[PDB]
């Protein structure tokens, strides 16, 4: 708390992973983003960081003369690398309940799947990325405005601490409700230069859940020694294409050891949509693709 | 000229030979939302395709349900690559199809902006009820909310494998419905025009197709015949950002994938930055790049 008269920056609500999902969903609806403390346990986060570390050592640091991949290591093969990720982290019931509240329709099953599973290590000195919305990946989505449905949501987990100085993500709460969704540039955004943000200060295992409609951007890692790690669990709706071809690069040995909802998340199993007709997305001539892969 | 002077002029489908300019076909497609391409598939290849899928079509039982869904007295079959050499080696390698797909979907400097949604043999059986009027892009349920200012979602190259007649269940198209100001469900509750919606049959010979926008209202007609099984081949093509209805890269044998050109590998998801592999083309891991 600050002296009376100080300006108050935007509110980023926070809940323990033990709070009711409806009370966390309620804050997600208000602000577009919410911090879930203890989403991952400190021992699970430590084990995951250690389990992906040898792959992360082999990634070189990309340094360039301009970007968002400037001094940032990126690694997406978490299912292959980390048993704690594939056995425990993706199996968070709180994650899946919130995904259902966002994405799933009645009588249709899982309305969502994985877009990506990226580990990020932001090096000391890495610059701050432009303000943007994640749904800009699906370029038509902004044109539907705040009345549009959700494209994507992110559970952005802290693996090491997120501080203001080591570059914690800067969010714009309530930007999912602005009347018009433009790109954030001088030409297109009238608020440009005048958009107040709030960092997502978190401890390891905390995550923020962020709508694809919310304006955000990574902060500058101003430190001397802090290599800030994050795990982005990016989840899209059933009808959108994933940025990783998990079902073609994850081995069937790991597919056979997954639960049915994890197979669905990675495309080892289909989902049934109802269109006036029950339609399989990602199916096989009227059957679940899981039959053919030997998973039923 | 076309209609007797003074009469109401109904909707009509422009027709082009397959040797016409893709620019001339695409102008028609933009004006009306659909266009016939005569001879999209050659007579010899159409015949070889039908014969190659016939055993797959024979092992498909005929439902007689009266439940109003799209499978009542309608056979549907999506394993054309696996079943037909002519399909995978010849029919999908039409330069005109890709030139048209490139004008609908591709942006400069980003490669192919499209891939396959489905490859479906649709054989309407004698007696089949008419299907509901719909837009194909209702499969991506938010798209209608964007209106005619929205971008293109899906297009289908709907090819006649056997003749399409007014009497055997030819599709009834509503040209220009891609420009109506509000895209709603086509039913009594939601559509003010319901019951006063002008359609046209797509009359076609084996090898003809119509290219149709996902924004166009259409529906199969009733097969009033007693023996005419109206066989069609629907090549559905979507933006690269959208999920296919078939998991073609998990069901098509790698043996067939290695015989595809690069562009057909891309159509089926054997080649990729969507659908990638941790920063690299998935075709590397699959062993398809040399």
UniProtKB/Swiss-Prot annotation, chain A:
UniProt-annotated site: Important for reaction specificity, residues: 152, 234
Cofactor: Fe cation
SUPFAM superfamilies in UniProt: Clavaminate synthase-like
Reaction catalysis annotation: preaustinoid A1 + 2-oxoglutarate + O2 = berkeleyone B + succinate + CO2 + H2O; berkeleyone B + 2-oxoglutarate + O2 = berkeleydione + succinate + CO2 + H2O; preaustinoid A + 2 2-oxoglutarate + 2 O2 = berkeleytrione + 2 succinate + 2 CO2 + H2O
Keyword terms of this UniProt record: Dioxygenase, Iron, Metal-binding, Oxidoreductase
Pfam families: PhyH
Entry EC no(s): 1.14.11.-
Protein name in UniProt: Multifunctional dioxygenase prhA
Swiss-Prot record, chain B:
Known outcome of mutating residue 236 to S: Completely loses its original activity, and instead catalyzes the AusE-type 'spiro-lactone formation' to yield preaustinoid A3 as a single product
Organism: Penicillium brasilianum
Residues carrying the site annotation Important for reaction specificity: 154, 236
Free-text function comment from the UniProt entry: Multifunctional dioxygenase; part of the gene cluster that mediates the biosynthesis of paraherquonin, a meroterpenoid with a unique, highly congested hexacyclic molecular architecture. The first step of the pathway is the synthesis of 3,5-dimethylorsellinic acid (DMOA) by the polyketide synthase prhL.
Complex and partners: Homodimer.
One Pfam family recorded for the sequence: PhyH
Metabolic or biological pathway: Secondary metabolite biosynthesis; terpenoid biosynthesis
Protein name per the record: Multifunctional dioxygenase prhA
UniProt cross-references to SUPFAM superfamilies, sorted A to Z: Clavaminate synthase-like (SSF51197)
Reactions accelerated catalytically: preaustinoid A1 + 2-oxoglutarate + O2 = berkeleyone B + succinate + CO2 + H2O; berkeleyone B + 2-oxoglutarate + O2 = berkeleydione + succinate + CO2 + H2O; preaustinoid A + 2 2-oxoglutarate + 2 O2 = berkeleytrione + 2 succinate + 2 CO2 + H2O
Domain observations: Residues at positions 150 and 232 are important for type of reaction catalyzed, using identical substrate. Both ausE and prhA accept preaustinoid A1 as a substrate to form divergent products through dynamic skeletal rearrangement.
Assigned keywords, A-Z: Dioxygenase, Iron, Metal-binding, Oxidoreductase
